[PDB]
Amino acid sequence: LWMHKVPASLMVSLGEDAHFQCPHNSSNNANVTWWRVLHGNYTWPPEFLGPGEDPNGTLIIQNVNKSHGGIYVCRVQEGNESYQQSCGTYLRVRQPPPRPFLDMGEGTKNRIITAEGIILLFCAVVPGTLLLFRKRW
Amino acid sequence: SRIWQSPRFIARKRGFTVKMHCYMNSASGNVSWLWKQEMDENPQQLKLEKGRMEESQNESLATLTIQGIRFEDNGIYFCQQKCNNTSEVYQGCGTELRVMGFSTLAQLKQRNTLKDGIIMIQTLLIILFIIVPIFLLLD
Amino acid sequence: LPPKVSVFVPPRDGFFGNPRKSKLICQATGFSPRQIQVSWLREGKQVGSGVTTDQVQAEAKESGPTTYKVTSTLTIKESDWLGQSMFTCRVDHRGLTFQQNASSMCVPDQDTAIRVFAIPPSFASIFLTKSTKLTCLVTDLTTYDSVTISWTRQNGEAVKTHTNISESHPNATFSAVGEASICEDDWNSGERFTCTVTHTDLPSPLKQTISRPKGVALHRPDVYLLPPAREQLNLRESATITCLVTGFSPADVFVQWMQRGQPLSPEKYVTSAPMPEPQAPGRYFAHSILTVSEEEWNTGETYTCVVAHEALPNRVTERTVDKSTEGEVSADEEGFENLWATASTFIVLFLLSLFYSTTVTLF
Amino acid sequence: LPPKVSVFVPPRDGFFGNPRKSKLICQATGFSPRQIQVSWLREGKQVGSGVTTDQVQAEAKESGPTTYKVTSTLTIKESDWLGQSMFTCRVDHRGLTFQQNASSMCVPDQDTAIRVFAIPPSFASIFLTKSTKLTCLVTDLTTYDSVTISWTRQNGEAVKTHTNISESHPNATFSAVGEASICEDDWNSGERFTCTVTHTDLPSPLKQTISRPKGVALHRPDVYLLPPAREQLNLRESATITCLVTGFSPADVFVQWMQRGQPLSPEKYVTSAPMPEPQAPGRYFAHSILTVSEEEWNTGETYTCVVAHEALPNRVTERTVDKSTEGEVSADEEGFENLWATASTFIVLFLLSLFYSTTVTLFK
Numbered sequence A: 001l002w003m004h005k006v007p008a009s010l011m012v013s014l015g016e017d018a019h020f021q022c023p024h025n026s027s028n029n030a031n032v033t034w035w036r037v038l039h040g041n042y043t044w045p046p047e048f049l050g051p052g053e054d055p056n057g058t059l060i061i062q063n064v065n066k067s068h069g070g071i072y073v074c075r076v077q078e079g080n081e082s083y084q085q086s087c088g089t090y091l092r093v094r095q096p097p098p099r100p101f102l103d104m105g106e107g108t109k110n111r112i113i114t115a116e117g118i119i120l121l122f123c124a125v126v127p128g129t130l131l132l133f134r135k136r137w
Numbered sequence B: 001s002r003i004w005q006s007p008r009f010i011a012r013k014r015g016f017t018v019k020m021h022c023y024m025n026s027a028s029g030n031v032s033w034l035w036k037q038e039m040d041e042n043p044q045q046l047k048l049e050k051g052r053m054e055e056s057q058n059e060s061l062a063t064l065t066i067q068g069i070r071f072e073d074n075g076i077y078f079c080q081q082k083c084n085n086t087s088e089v090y091q092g093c094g095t096e097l098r099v100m101g102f103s104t105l106a107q108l109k110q111r112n113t114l115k116d117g118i119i120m121i122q123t124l125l126i127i128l129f130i131i132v133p134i135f136l137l138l139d
Numbered sequence C: 001l002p003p004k005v006s007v008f009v010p011p012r013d014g015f016f017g018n019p020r021k022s023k024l025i026c027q028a029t030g031f032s033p034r035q036i037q038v039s040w041l042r043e044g045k046q047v048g049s050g051v052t053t054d055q056v057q058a059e060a061k062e063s064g065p066t067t068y069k070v071t072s073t074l075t076i077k078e079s080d081w082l083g084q085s086m087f088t089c090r091v092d093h094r095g096l097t098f099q100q101n102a103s104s105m106c107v108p109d110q111d112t113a114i115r116v117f118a119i120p121p122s123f124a125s126i127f128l129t130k131s132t133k134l135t136c137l138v139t140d141l142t143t144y145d146s147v148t149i150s151w152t153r154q155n156g157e158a159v160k161t162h163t164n165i166s167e168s169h170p171n172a173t174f175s176a177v178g179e180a181s182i183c184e185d186d187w188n189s190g191e192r193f194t195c196t197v198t199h200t201d202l203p204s205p206l207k208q209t210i211s212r213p214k215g216v217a218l219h220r221p222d223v224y225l226l227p228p229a230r231e232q233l234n235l236r237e238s239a240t241i242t243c244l245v246t247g248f249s250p251a252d253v254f255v256q257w258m259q260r261g262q263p264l265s266p267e268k269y270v271t272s273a274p275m276p277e278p279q280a281p282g283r284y285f286a287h288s289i290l291t292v293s294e295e296e297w298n299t300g301e302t303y304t305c306v307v308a309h310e311a312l313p314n315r316v317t318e319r320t321v322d323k324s325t326e327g328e329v330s331a332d333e334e335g336f337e338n339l340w341a342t343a344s345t346f347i348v349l350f351l352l353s354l355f356y357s358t359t360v361t362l363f
Numbered sequence D: 001l002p003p004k005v006s007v008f009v010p011p012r013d014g015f016f017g018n019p020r021k022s023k024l025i026c027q028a029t030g031f032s033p034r035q036i037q038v039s040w041l042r043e044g045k046q047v048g049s050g051v052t053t054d055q056v057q058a059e060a061k062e063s064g065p066t067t068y069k070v071t072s073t074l075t076i077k078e079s080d081w082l083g084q085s086m087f088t089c090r091v092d093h094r095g096l097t098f099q100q101n102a103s104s105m106c107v108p109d110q111d112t113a114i115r116v117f118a119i120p121p122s123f124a125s126i127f128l129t130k131s132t133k134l135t136c137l138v139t140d141l142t143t144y145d146s147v148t149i150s151w152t153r154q155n156g157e158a159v160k161t162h163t164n165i166s167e168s169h170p171n172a173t174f175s176a177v178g179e180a181s182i183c184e185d186d187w188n189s190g191e192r193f194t195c196t197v198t199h200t201d202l203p204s205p206l207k208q209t210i211s212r213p214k215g216v217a218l219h220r221p222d223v224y225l226l227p228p229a230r231e232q233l234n235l236r237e238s239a240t241i242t243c244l245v246t247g248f249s250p251a252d253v254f255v256q257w258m259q260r261g262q263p264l265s266p267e268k269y270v271t272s273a274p275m276p277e278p279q280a281p282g283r284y285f286a287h288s289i290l291t292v293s294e295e296e297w298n299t300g301e302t303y304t305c306v307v308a309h310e311a312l313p314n315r316v317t318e319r320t321v322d323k324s325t326e327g328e329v330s331a332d333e334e335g336f337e338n339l340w341a342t343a344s345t346f347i348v349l350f351l352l353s354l355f356y357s358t359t360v361t362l363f364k
């Protein structure tokens, strides 16, 4: 069904805004609520986070800090019927990873280092031979 | 509802073990696993070789273990068990796996800066070793 | 008809005469027919003076046969009363001996009081079940009657009594649970609740008390979690994983452990009780211990530690450890094959260049 | 002729039935004429239920004018009687009111009977000073004379009586802190020590043959010492070193911290009481934590932890962690870094050969 389409992780740095979504199937007559759930077969009740903020079903969270992990679950019900609930989008956060020299990672620098070394050895032998053996004669 | 699966996200370090549990009732036959990377968008069947990925099954708890993980195991694993008495496929939403490296922030930064400092030196010396002898011999 | 023999001793003050004298009434009524033989045996010996056994008057009991009543009397002096003599009533009624042994002074027999525990309601048991029950437990009594565990509020009025008295125990240490109920707001207002216990063997009740402090401030805890030390693992016997809830106010933290998604039974871990922090003035700390086999910890088996405090922003938080308390950034970068190829190439390359260096030095 | 009003109560072992019930008798004889009325009362409330007043029958007398007799009875429940409530009976003879008290509270016996007990020497006292002693505490008594405490031996031998008697207790009582120095092996041998107390008022001695409770076998604890967690160190506020003892028997262990040789103040660490172990039989474990400033931890400062038990051979063991307890983070990280170090060395070592060869050829 549609209870499997949602991803399994989300990547954000602190202080930014994340984006979720819950793809409803009842024609704009349903109710969308967002919850935050514990491990699984939990005992503490889940908490009510926020309602559907815009018509298309998107939740936006700001002011990201260290204590904003955990599973986020969208629960939708149509009037008097039972609710339909996805199985969440785990959220993992850490800001730091830096810039330097984005062009290549360690997977490339070593290869061009070894190529440059072998080419330098190849090119630094002929000049000495030409300078030396062409002087005596 | 009928099929319960945990955990939802696992981020180990390269070399260790991972276990995934599918909880299901012991009425409708045996359980077969699936697999899905993010290059695909339709689950594939899972192969199995002994020593690596291995499966077992107790009364109402089926499990899978992988030994010595590596970078080619970053997919979502699904457990599926169709009823042989009603003919309806029931499927959980599975697990996720990530494989972390051996380094930290501090070591990486130093290694990168040292490597770049070395990498410019060979360029400078190759330029010198190609420019000096030609200027000397050409007279 | 065998009657009910009862003897009604006077109180100590009710004396009259010089020397002062009082009386005993050995009223054993509800019997038929008329025949009766009453012997007021003081110290097992009958008294010939002052024993006034009146006539056997017919008890006009309309329901059934008309029975008969008797009214025995005996007088003793002040010194006789305090002489601790056994003024036993032995009535040879209808050829049958009925004996009733009683004292002759104010003797609550004799001295036995044990314990009573009043347990207040915690906070986790209000948010979960929405019922602020409060019990006070009486321990290691005898399964006799006349036990009355009664809660009273601060205004003298009472609330409901108990149920579910426990069963027999090997040491005859039975117990009772005086559960009651109260609206949450009244308990939160913080008034003193007292529970009273009475017994046939108790010279006086046992007024306990329980109330809630008012005016405490809120601080949030900081749960850390440590793995077993290497010296323990080298034994290949067991391991202990400890949570640590440090620096919270007020008391009553609530913790539990989970594994595989299924919570563990309460017979594994051993939680502690809050006690004051050494350097901080008004904060506490707690603990928890989980014992697992050593082979279990060596093949994965991630564990968790759920706590719940009333000052936390969302009332719950959760930590975890498996064996690899590691795994920082750089999943795919840093290389693993280039680092071998480069090392091999530059181990070969310098050795090759040394030959050219030797030839150059030769020329 | 006013009657002689009397009140009688039943003994505590006189209640029967379900619910258990008894009776009270209010009797007043020797009155004339027959005009008489009787009313029962319950702390100001009159209850008519269970009231059986007899007819005014003439008393059987041999001489003088013939008077009359009357008997009144009341029924009560036991839970009311045991709750310390007061019942009174009132008799109205010729319009004259006579009231009499009755209650189940004639317990008190004001005498010198007081609680006399003792506190055994804990293991902290004996290990610190080798000063095995025992204390016989006396309360519920005020200032008297000849209040002599004798720590009688098995056969009542010599005893050094207590000194430095305190002031009057705030109860209006007096606290006699008995004390007597004692040998060592006698207490471990299960010998009878009674502090017989002599008094001027009641010289009855309350004897308690206290001794060592022979019992549980001997086990030795083992100390595992834990450095602070990383996420605490990141806070840069404080650290909490933990000393852990497990699997000892019996209870009463003694632990104290110490660095550089001199002990830390007893106001710096907190030690919990022994608690049972959930798996084994009645063996215990205890935890002691010390809170240091994080700046001190980044220099050195061993912080040894010293325990002291009974079954332990030398009665003292030490543990030590300063800053190096990472403990085999992995088996491949060190190889990875070693390989990188070799490659980095060989790069700069290789460049020298090229430079030297080229310059030597040029300079020939």
Ligand SMILES: *[C@@H]1O[C@H](CO)[C@@H](O[C@@H]2O[C@H](CO)[C@@H](O[C@@H]3O[C@H](CO)[C@@H](O)[C@H](O[C@H]4O[C@H](CO)[C@@H](O)[C@H](O)[C@@H]4O[C@@H]4O[C@H](CO)[C@@H](O)[C@H](O)[C@H]4NC(C)=O)[C@@H]3O)[C@H](O)[C@H]2NC(C)=O)[C@H](O)[C@H]1NC(C)=O
Binding pocket: C117, C118, C119, C120, C139, C140, C169, C170, C171, C172, C173, C174, C175
């Ligand atoms: C023969 O066998 C029977 C069968 O077990 C034994 O009966 C046991 O008797 C024990 C007597 O101590 C009972 O233990 C008590 O009851 C509770 C179980 O542990 C416990 O609540 C009691 O602990 C109180 O005492 C501590 C020490 O004084 C206090 O410091 C502590 O605060 C406890 O008081 C309350 O404790 C509860 C915890 O449940 C807290 O929530 C409250 O906040 C505390 N309030 C206060 C004011 O302190 C104590 O251990 C035991 O229950 C009972 N077994 C049963 C009923 O099954 C006989 O003893 C045995 N005969 C022998 C050995 O001679």
Ligand SMILES: *[C@@H]1O[C@H](CO)[C@@H](O[C@@H]2O[C@H](CO)[C@@H](O[C@@H]3O[C@H](CO)[C@@H](O)[C@H](O[C@H]4O[C@H](CO)[C@@H](O)[C@H](O)[C@@H]4O)[C@@H]3O)[C@H](O)[C@H]2NC(C)=O)[C@H](O)[C@H]1NC(C)=O
Binding pocket: D137, D139, D140, D169, D170, D171, D175
């Ligand atoms: C008069 O006021 C004084 C204070 O000015 C008060 O003195 C103290 O009373 C306590 C309580 O009775 C005494 O404590 C007793 O003795 C030791 C001392 O540590 C305690 O361990 C005892 O506790 C055990 O016994 C209790 C009763 O059996 C148990 O309930 C308990 O769990 C323990 O097993 C016991 O409480 C204390 O010794 C005195 N102080 C001195 C210096 O003696 C005194 O009680 C007041 N008197 C009256 C009649 O109120």
Ligand SMILES: *[C@@H]1O[C@H](CO)[C@@H](O)[C@H](O)[C@H]1NC(C)=O
Binding pocket: A001, A002, A025, A026
């Ligand atoms: C939504 O999905 C359900 C299947 O669970 C399907 O029956 C329904 O038709 C879908 N709604 C729309 C609008 O496609």
Ligand SMILES: *[C@@H]1O[C@H](CO)[C@@H](O)[C@H](O)[C@H]1NC(C)=O
Binding pocket: A031, A032, A033, A079
């Ligand atoms: C949707 O849910 C919220 C809270 O769950 C409720 O307040 C609201 O009335 C609901 N809307 C409808 C249309 O039922």
Ligand SMILES: *[C@@H]1O[C@H](CO)[C@@H](O)[C@H](O)[C@H]1NC(C)=O
Binding pocket: A041, B004, B023, C262, C263
């Ligand atoms: C765990 O889940 C099962 C069903 O999978 C359920 O029967 C059980 O009650 C749950 N555990 C608890 C403590 O409720």
Ligand SMILES: *[C@@H]1O[C@H](CO)[C@@H](O)[C@H](O)[C@H]1NC(C)=O
Binding pocket: A056, A057, A058
């Ligand atoms: C909002 O939902 C609509 C579907 O109704 C979709 O077309 C649109 O792309 C969505 N917007 C965002 C920002 O996801």
Ligand SMILES: *[C@@H]1O[C@H](CO)[C@@H](O)[C@H](O)[C@H]1NC(C)=O
Binding pocket: A063, A064, A065, A066, A067, C313
């Ligand atoms: C992030 O912000 C929230 C609310 O402002 C706060 O409760 C939390 O402690 C913050 N996180 C950190 C690490 O300070």
Ligand SMILES: *[C@@H]1O[C@H](CO)[C@@H](O)[C@H](O)[C@H]1NC(C)=O
Binding pocket: A080
């Ligand atoms: C709606 O649900 C309620 C249960 O709260 C039920 O009593 C009622 O009959 C339902 N009505 C319809 C139309 O389904």
Ligand SMILES: *[C@@H]1O[C@H](CO)[C@@H](O)[C@H](O)[C@H]1NC(C)=O
Binding pocket: B029, B030, B031
């Ligand atoms: C699992 O069940 C199937 C279906 O009955 C049967 O082949 C066998 O019991 C199991 N299959 C295995 C062990 O390959």
Ligand SMILES: *[C@@H]1O[C@H](CO)[C@@H](O)[C@H](O)[C@H]1NC(C)=O
Binding pocket: B057, B058, B059
């Ligand atoms: C299945 O679980 C039970 C626990 O009730 C255990 O006793 C049994 O050994 C397990 N079976 C296997 C094959 O591990």
Ligand SMILES: *[C@@H]1O[C@H](CO)[C@@H](O)[C@H](O)[C@H]1NC(C)=O
Binding pocket: C086, C099, C100, C101
């Ligand atoms: C007193 O009488 C009771 C009658 O039940 C008897 O059990 C008890 O042994 C008697 N005691 C003495 C000292 O005569």
Ligand SMILES: *[C@@H]1O[C@H](CO)[C@@H](O)[C@H](O)[C@H]1NC(C)=O
Binding pocket: C163, C164, C165
């Ligand atoms: C004990 O308490 C439970 C729950 O309050 C109740 O259901 C039960 O009936 C009680 N026991 C008795 C004997 O009434």
Ligand SMILES: *[C@@H]1O[C@H](CO)[C@@H](O)[C@H](O)[C@H]1NC(C)=O
Binding pocket: D086, D088, D099, D100, D101
């Ligand atoms: C009986 O007791 C009451 C108090 O309850 C007291 O006022 C009254 O004086 C007592 N009766 C006599 C005769 O003293």
Ligand SMILES: *[C@@H]1O[C@H](CO)[C@@H](O)[C@H](O)[C@H]1NC(C)=O
Binding pocket: D163, D164
């Ligand atoms: C007796 O008490 C005094 C203080 O009143 C104290 O100085 C002295 O050391 C005590 N003596 C003993 C032997 O404890």
